[PDB]
């Protein structure tokens, strides 16, 4: 009954998703109760037809029932206040911001595909002395001594001394699981661990959704400069396997082609995968080595052809 | 005229290099008074006839079109008198609203002329106002039979 009444909510795979789904079930229960009573009122007053027995006498013509107005304007306030309290306590576990993440994934989301960096891994049980790449971050400070003019301008840069095309906010890593248009990216994560996602976008605002996480976040170009908390954590992921992930914003033409996968494997499988990726190997090769299908099983790559009726 | 000769540049022949058959630009338009003939050339749909061992190019179509335009323009008063029946010595003008059919016909003709004039400019219209060149050509082709009718109806009702 829970699945049917959840209105197509995928049963969460992380405690945050489970709790959010429970809140959704409660909210839908309350909303359906309110809807049932109001629809009952409507279909009941629809029984107050203009009966032919009604002689030349109009109805009571009352209007203006102050006590009833007060009752029906105080009860909704209490209902929404309870909903708001539950919403606040649930939202509290939206990003606990644990200062000790077990694996940090640098989620760059560029124009019409994804890239996952594996910025840092530090298992609480004790393992994975791994880190990201501090180099490769090259600024674009246009601090030339002189511009077109002869002297005096000594222009530093448009914004904070930097040109708009800077990409210093973008952080890079040694292990990059870039997604090609013909090879859907598969971010592999260890099951049972705390996984932090540091979200960034290369070109345009867009979204990052894992329907099984019951949570999405907008990958912004420069979240820190935009006053956005791009980074967000997931306490755990119990269920293993591959879970589709969509882009949940507007990106451009190929916005529906940004589907990726999150493949939750066992911690030992993640050990083997990261070791074999540190060794020169692609994501598909590492998946095959750890004996898991290399290509995204939940979603095939979209046909790069612009449509069915195009003549190939 | 002097102010415009000063302040506005007309026909910069120095920019327009000397004529050479191998060279050409993209504009290639005549002055606005011949722009309607050029637009007729552009819009007319490439209908050529090939009699026994001969060719009848699309140029004849536009030539006959110009001939018809001039013949009708020259012979309108006699056409109008034959149609309506009025040969009375008229010295008092009549407001264009007071003659719905003639003002409607004149509006239709002006609409056709404007359509042809802008068809001749479809190249620059397409370039600046971002509309595909084929779209502009076919807009002209369809309009030169649709727009005159629309303008005729609208002008007739407007006069009434």
């Amino acid at each position: 009954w829970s699945d049917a009444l959840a209105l197509g909510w995928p049963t969460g795979i992380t405690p945050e998703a489970k709790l959010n789904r429970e809140l959704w079930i409660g909210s839908v229960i309350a909303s359906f109760a309110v809807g049932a009573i109001v629809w009952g009122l409507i279909f009941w007053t629809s029984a107050f037809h203009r009966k032919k027995a009604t002689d030349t006498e109009l109805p009571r013509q009352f209007g203006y029932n102050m006590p009833l107005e007060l009752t029906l304007t105080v009860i909704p306030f209490l209902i929404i206040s309870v909903l708001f309290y539950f919403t606040v306590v649930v939202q509290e576990r939206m990003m606990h911001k644990d200062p000790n993440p077990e694996v940090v994934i640098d989620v760059t989301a560029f124009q019409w595909n994804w890239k996952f960096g594996y910025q840092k891994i530090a298992f609480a049980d004790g393992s994975f002395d791994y880190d990201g790449a501090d180099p490769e971050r090259k600024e674009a400070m246009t601090s030339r001594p002189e511009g077109k003019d002869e002297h005096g301008i000594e222009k530093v840069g448009p914004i904070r001394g930097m040109t708009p095309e800077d990409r210093t906010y973008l952080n890079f890593d040694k292990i990059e699981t870039l997604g090609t248009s013909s090879e859907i990216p598969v971010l592999v994560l260890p099951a049972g661990k705390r996984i932090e996602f540091v979200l960034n976008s290369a070109d345009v605002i867009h979204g990052f959704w894992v329907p099984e996480f019951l949570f999405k976040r907008d990958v912004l170009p420069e979240p820190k400069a935009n006053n956005s908390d791009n980074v967000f954590q997931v306490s755990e992921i119990q269920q293993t396997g591959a879970f589709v992930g969509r882009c949940t914003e507007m990106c451009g033409t190929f916005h529906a082609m940004m589907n990726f996968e999150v493949r939750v494997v066992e911690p030992n499988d993640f050990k083997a995968y990261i070791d074999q990726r540190n060794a020169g190997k692609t994501n598909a090769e590492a998946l095959a080595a750890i004996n898991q299908p290399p290509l995204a099983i939940t979603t095939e790559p979209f046909e790069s052809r612009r449509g069915e009726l195009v003549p190939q | 005229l002097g102010l415009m000769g000063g302040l506005l540049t007309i026909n910069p022949i120095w920019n327009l290099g000397p004529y050479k058959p191998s060279q050409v630009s993209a504009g290639s338009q005549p002055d606005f008074y011949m722009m309607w003939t050029d637009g007729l050339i552009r819009l007319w749909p490439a209908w050529e006839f090939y009699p026994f061992g001969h060719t009848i190019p699309q140029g004849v179509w536009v030539a006959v079109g110009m001939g018809l335009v001039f013949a009708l323009l020259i012979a309108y008063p006699f056409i109008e008198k034959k149609v309506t029946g009025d040969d009375a010595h008229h010295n008092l003008l009549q407001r264009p609203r007071d003659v719905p059919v003639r003002t409607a016909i004149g509006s239709m003709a002006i609409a056709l002329y404007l359509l042809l004039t802008f068809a001749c400019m479809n190249d620059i219209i397409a370039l600046k106002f971002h509309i595909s060149l084929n779209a502009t050509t076919w807009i002209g082709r369809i309009g030169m039979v649709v727009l005159p009718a629309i303008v005729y109806f609208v002008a007739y009702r407007w006069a009434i």
Binding site: - | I10, I13, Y19, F32, Y33, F70, A88, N91, L93, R102
Partner: protein, 54 residues
């Protein structure tokens, strides 16, 4: 520019006379010669801006 204004003003004058009916019974020959004049002006400008081989 005078050529362009000449053509434009001939066109506007033609519009005026046609719409006000300044051609019927009398002045019909005047309209005829005016039409010839407009055609001549058109081709005159055509030969004019074609005169400097460009």
């Amino acid at each position: 520019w005078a050529a362009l204004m000449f053509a434009a003003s001939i066109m506007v004058h033609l519009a005026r006379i046609f719409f006000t009916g300044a051609f019927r019974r009398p002045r019909e020959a005047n309209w005829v010669i005016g039409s010839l004049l407009l055609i001549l002006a058109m081709f005159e400008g055509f030969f004019g801006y074609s005169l400097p081989d460009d």
